[PDB]
Design a protein around this ligand. Sequence first.
Ligand code: SF4
Ligand SMILES: [Mg+2]
Length: 258
Amino acid sequence: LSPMERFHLKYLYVTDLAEQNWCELQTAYGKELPGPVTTKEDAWAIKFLNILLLIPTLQSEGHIREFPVFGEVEGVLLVGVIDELHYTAKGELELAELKTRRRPMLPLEAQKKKDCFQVSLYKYIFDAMVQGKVTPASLIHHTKLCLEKPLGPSVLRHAQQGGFSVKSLGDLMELVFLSLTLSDLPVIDILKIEYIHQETATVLGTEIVAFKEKEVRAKVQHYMAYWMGHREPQGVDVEEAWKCRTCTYADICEWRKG
Ligand code: SF4
Ligand SMILES: [Mg+2]
């Protein structure tokens, strides 16, 4: 029985893989020992209507926030939300992820590696979306969305308020696929992480992620291999054994003992 089946998971979040970069075993324990008026058809419809509104905003106002992303990645559906997207002064599409720290210390290199992998996943999924690699069939196969169930009045409220007339959920998805791929949306050019002190608003550092598609794909194939149940989960390396000093599951983790 695969972890996705054991933990009753049908898709994953981008942060689930980011926390998996910190420790795969700690992430596994987090899903095993954790510590309805709307419908999944309605929730995804709201996500689609947000996209249909954000695409022209980014292409006209040049700046958007909270852009949802999704797509099948190595047999697993990965879902995420981009903090910020905007065109630079040179016409480059830049992604911004803001990290606030309560203490004014520089971020750990292990924290930077985890954050670099999170935004690399954002570009990985976003680029696949605007280039026509994410179909409505792949989402329906993974989310079990029933297309003939009519959308609840909460969504038609959220919709016609913006002027658009929705048909069924299937027609809503086909317009999203059209608007993602045929509206001249480019690939994300710049991946930018910014670390800020919460109080004094001091810049604690700024990373510009050097995106390499082959390395990103290889790391994803390795991580998704565990979730599909093809290999045992791994703990942290010995040089990063300090991660278990504060790990919730350090008292029953037999990797830290072995
Ligand atoms: S104790 Fe260390 S190796 Fe074990 S789950 Fe926690 S962080 Fe991972
Ligand atoms: Mg964010």
